Amino acid sequence: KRPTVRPRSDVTHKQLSAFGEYVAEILPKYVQQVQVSCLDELEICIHPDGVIPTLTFLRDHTNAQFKSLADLTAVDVPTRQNRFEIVYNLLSLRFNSRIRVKTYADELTPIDSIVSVHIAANWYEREVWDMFGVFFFNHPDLRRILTDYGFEGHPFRKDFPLTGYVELRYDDEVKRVVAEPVELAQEFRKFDLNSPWEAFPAYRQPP
Amino acid sequence: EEMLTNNRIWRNRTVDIGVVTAEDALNYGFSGVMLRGSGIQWDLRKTQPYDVYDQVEFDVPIGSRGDCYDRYLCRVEEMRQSLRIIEQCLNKMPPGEIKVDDAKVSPPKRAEMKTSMESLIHHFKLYTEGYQVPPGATYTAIEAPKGEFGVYLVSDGSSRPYRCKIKAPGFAHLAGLDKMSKGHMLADVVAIIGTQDIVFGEIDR
Amino acid sequence: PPPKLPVGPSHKLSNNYYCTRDGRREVVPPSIIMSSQKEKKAVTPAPPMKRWELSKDQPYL
Amino acid sequence: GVVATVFGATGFLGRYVVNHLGRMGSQVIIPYRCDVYDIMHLRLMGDLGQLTFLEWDARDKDSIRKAVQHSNVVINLIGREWETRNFDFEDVFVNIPRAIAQASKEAGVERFIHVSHLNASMKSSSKSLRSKAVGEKEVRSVFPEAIIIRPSDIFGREDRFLNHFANYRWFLAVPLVSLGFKTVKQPVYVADVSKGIVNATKDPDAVGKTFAFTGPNRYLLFHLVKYIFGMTHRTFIPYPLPLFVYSWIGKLFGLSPFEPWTTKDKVERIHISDVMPTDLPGLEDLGVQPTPLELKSIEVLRRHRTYRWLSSEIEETKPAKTVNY
Amino acid sequence: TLDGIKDRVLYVLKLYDKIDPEKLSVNSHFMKDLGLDSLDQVEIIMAMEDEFGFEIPDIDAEKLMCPQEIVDYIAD
Amino acid sequence: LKKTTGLVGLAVCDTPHERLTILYTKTLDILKHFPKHAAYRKYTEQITNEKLDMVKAEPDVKKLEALLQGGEVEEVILQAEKELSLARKMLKWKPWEPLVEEPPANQWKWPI
Amino acid sequence: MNLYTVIFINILLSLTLILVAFWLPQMNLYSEKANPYECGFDPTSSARLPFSMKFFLVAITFLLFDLEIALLLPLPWAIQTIKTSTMMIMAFILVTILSLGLAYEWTQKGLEWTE
Amino acid sequence: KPIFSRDLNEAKRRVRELYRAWYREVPNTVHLMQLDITVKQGRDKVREMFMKNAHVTDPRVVDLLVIKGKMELQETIKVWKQRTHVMRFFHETETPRPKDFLSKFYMGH
Amino acid sequence: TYKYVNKKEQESEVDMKSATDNAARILMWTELIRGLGMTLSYLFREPATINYPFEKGPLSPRFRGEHALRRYPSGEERCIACKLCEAICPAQAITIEAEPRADGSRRTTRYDIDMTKCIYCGFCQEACPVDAIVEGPNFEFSTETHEELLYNKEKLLNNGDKWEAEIAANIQADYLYR
Amino acid sequence: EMVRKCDPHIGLLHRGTEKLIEYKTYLQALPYFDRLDYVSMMCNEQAYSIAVEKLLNIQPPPRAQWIRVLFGEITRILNHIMAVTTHALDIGAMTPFFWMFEE
């Protein structure tokens, strides 16, 4: 049809909408929203209390064998009341399909670890805790994973400075690698590349 | 293959080392050769094809014992299947352009940039501010050589990505190293590390 | 030898308005199937995956 | 805005001086004669363009002028504990300091900082100390506002003091003159001395004065060596030995073509007792709080122990007895 | 031997350095009198455990505010 | 009798039909304890009844697998066990109840 | 004498090599260099801790087999005897006894390493 | 809502247990890692770090602090954290800046 | 479609000949001798190693090497202080300050590239509208000091003058693909 | 020599790529994906390109897609060479490494 536009199919969209209604009506106690994007990606937004029940169902149920935990992520949206949005991306090999499950958490409102459901989360949850500060209940071994051993802070938070507060160098006087406040020969340049004109009228938030 | 496949020393040093069952692989989140050497029939190139992979013929190797030896055979066979795909690519290469003819997304040819006002403006803006991506979120996965390489990308409508989580196939594999090393010696652990196929650039990000 | 590379589909001198071939402007927000702000037969996320076929090129290695 | 030329950087105290200058952020010029390999440890002590290494020779005065060309401060740490075949104590502690001072005066350096020794006296039994007194006089003659620093014994990781004493284990027993008694030592910490020099590079009141950098406590040589051997859990077998025999042993050890383990002058200075402050300013004038030997002896002496005693706490050793003379 | 218990307790309370030896007494509240803090009293309890070779749970330990209380507890 | 399943760690069952009937019957029996309007009860009963009817109709194992569309009969047995355990867990979770709590005002608004 | 001389010369050559190796190079000593090695991170425990042996049974079997070699080594002189029948019977019996011991350990799983 | 402790008293019990654990571990840490400090200095540092958070009043924040302190305690118990990582608690490379207005005026702004 | 890399073939193929062949394989080390034969075959082949200093590997016209700033044939410098190079540099290695030259021309007064910060990607030379900044074919510009790897405008211009013939040839060969 | 427990410690090559990418444009962030998995560079950047194309709702031309598949397969051969012949090297077989790194 149009060479430079992605070809879209409605069969997948209709199947995903049907399954979204299916899951929503099977778990009314936890499901707070359901949506299928124009990319055809079913997305179920749940209450944080329903994480373990939802994942156990989506893994064990015959009509939803989402047995592979492809991803466990957190997105930081500072404005909203609950800063962190926890995203589980799951794959069902029996039905050759993918689903996404979302919940929310705050710096002081932990989430239930799903290591019982999926063991793949054992390290993804550790990474989320290390980089965002989201705590997880009933985790076998929750601790830092990616950051330095004595590192203080949660880098992936948007309020964290890009270059942090500390840096390392070797100090001959003490014969060690010492941590000191960061000083840069040239500071990071934050180019303002935002135009005044809106590019997409379809995403115009009402005034 | 003449050097390694049938060598009794290699067979003793790899066979039955780090055996992983299909269910444990799925539940630990293994992908690619780690799944396929344990009997699971999965391969994104076949099941969720991307680009023109649906236009080429190849066979997905499958293991039976789920050990280091089966995974090594799987990789050696995947190399041959990649040759098989490469032949078809070399023979079917179509003629045409190479980047989407949409100067609001891909930069225009320099010859046009040096002649046309619209192309010059679009080149300037593409290499200064970049193209804006409409708001949304996607998860895209491919059968990368090490497994399923994924990207969960969140765009806030601007020209800079809001979030970009990288699903490195080795991150889930290295987590199962403790499981696979049970009942094995230090030399066996060394053998196990190679089969997982780990580059730490993707693991650490 | 020197190359002479071709042109893309949208190098027409006419009937080539960008509003027709614009891709980014056709993206629409996700469809809200169910929201808390506002007998049927059991279904699956997609038809069950077909079983694979043993290769004819060389089934056993 | 300080540009400082350190003339003895490639040494025990020069490295600390350069390190502290680099931390202060002042440009540093290191004139060296050693091999390029010997300055790699200084190489990383400063950010880009902060440190400038240039080759020099004491004989060639053009090199000295080049080194002191664009410098506001000139620190002179030149020295040596033995008389080289080409350079002796007179040259090392008088001729070279005088030449450096005169070149600095001619160039127009604002500050000149010369390091001598606490017991530097014209009547000292030690050749090195007697030469150091003359060097002080000549430096203050050719650069009348030159600051003079007179450290006591300096102890650190790369020192020739605590290491020197702990190395007596290779000779079974420790020979001492008068069995250590009748000899008072006041060792100072190398970091404290370096901080003092760097601070004097800018302290407005320091110009033209003479300082005496001495540690907080004074020990009898016997108790100090006993403490050293207690820290390096070794068997301390002290015994007396008259100074003439000690000087003969030093003469023997000073015949090596390389770096002598000990020397006549070295034993003389080991056994000459340190003086008292006596109205000289001291470190606290420049703002350095002297660090006691008890805190920093472990980091110097832990490498002289055997496996059995390698992981022993600082508090497992009885502190020495400090005199009040 | 309650007298021996009370002597060991006083020995440890005097070997502790934050307190004031002369003002230290068998009747001197750690918080109200001597001036000790919560953490200080925790260290005091740990020192008593060291001396008596005996453990103490936190629930029981939070109340041992005075040496007489300590010795009464050691009576156990 | 199958010499092997294709999957490592999954043994071949010699009584596939009997085992499948056992597990499906157990799932139906446990679902009998769910509230009548539980959508999970309704849908799981549908699925289990369909699969049990297929098992009853088909004696041959290969054609039974073809009908079941679940890979190997051993995989179908595994999925039946998983469904039974999930039903047991759901009977305590009680997810049919009304939404536990609504989100804040704009918790799912994107782009923000 | 011709053997003591050569052995002493070898010992002296090795000792001279050691002396040169230690007293020729320029040496710079500090604790960071002289510390033990472990892939760049400090060891978490001493190397003198017990280090379990999973082939202890095979070691104590090797002792007995070494004594069996001791018993078998005089065979070159033994075969020079006029009682060749007795010597053969004894050699065969000894070797078969050794084989039976090895086979019994093998079957009882003594040659397998402990886990 | 409670992360662990219902109230500040339970949170304080957890904090005091953590202080006991760190106080107990300091000697073993010094001995094993061959630090050039004294047990007195190590325990003083533990107290200083505990008191640096004495202003907190929220039980949830106290629970987070205790969890992260327990993590550091595990990291130190095990020798995952090396001597270079532990000696950073002492900041023996920092030259303190003054709080005097005139001193600040002289140096910088 | 799939294939079995290692699938059991049979567990009952018993004849004397097969048993004896397997015994000979085990006791005579047949595959080990085969591997030895492969290595022996490799010994007698011409080694692929090249005499590097006097014999270098191939390089395409697109090879991204040390940066350089070019001049027009008339000796004028192409750089016109666009700062597209600076804006696009992903690693922020470029730093430019420009002033209106005495001619009234738009020219740069300083143009510094931190070659220890550059990822050698070519975005600068593909975003430069006048082919001013290029990556020549030089891959041998290691130094003994860090500061030597902070290139300034004079260094870049000297590199351009030095490699002008080769840079021009590479651009001539490759520009039609651009 | 039996392994009773394994504790992998990573993060010794965590440079903060995900946070850095937030400060770049999509084109400026493309090269990070070459460096992610430094043995399958083109596969990584192809994954990133497919994600960005999905969000942009554009389709790369057929010749571009065929080139991408061809080089994805070349990259897979490269990566499998590295994997097989470094597994062999760690086991103790050295010569496959030298034979295959020519290719």
Ligand SMILES: NC(=O)C1=CN([C@@H]2O[C@H](COP(=O)(O)OP(=O)(O)OC[C@H]3O[C@@H](n4cnc5c(N)ncnc54)[C@H](OP(=O)(O)O)[C@@H]3O)[C@@H](O)[C@H]2O)C=CC1
């Ligand atoms: N216990 C102590 O360490 C005490 C030291 N001092 C004084 O502090 C100063 C520093 O001595 P320290 O550095 O501690 O011990 P060093 O012996 O290490 O000082 C030697 C310095 O002098 C340089 N030097 C020696 N001879 C020559 C020469 N002929 N020409 C040029 N440079 C030369 C050396 O350079 P290279 O080594 O590269 O030749 C080195 O930089 C000396 O004056 C010393 O007396 C004061 C009190 C006690």
Ligand code: SF4
């Ligand atoms: S390098 Fe190129 S784009 Fe940048 S200022 Fe110079 S001419 Fe313009």
Ligand code: SF4
């Ligand atoms: S090659 Fe890339 S990283 Fe290097 S200076 Fe040019 S744009 Fe910057």
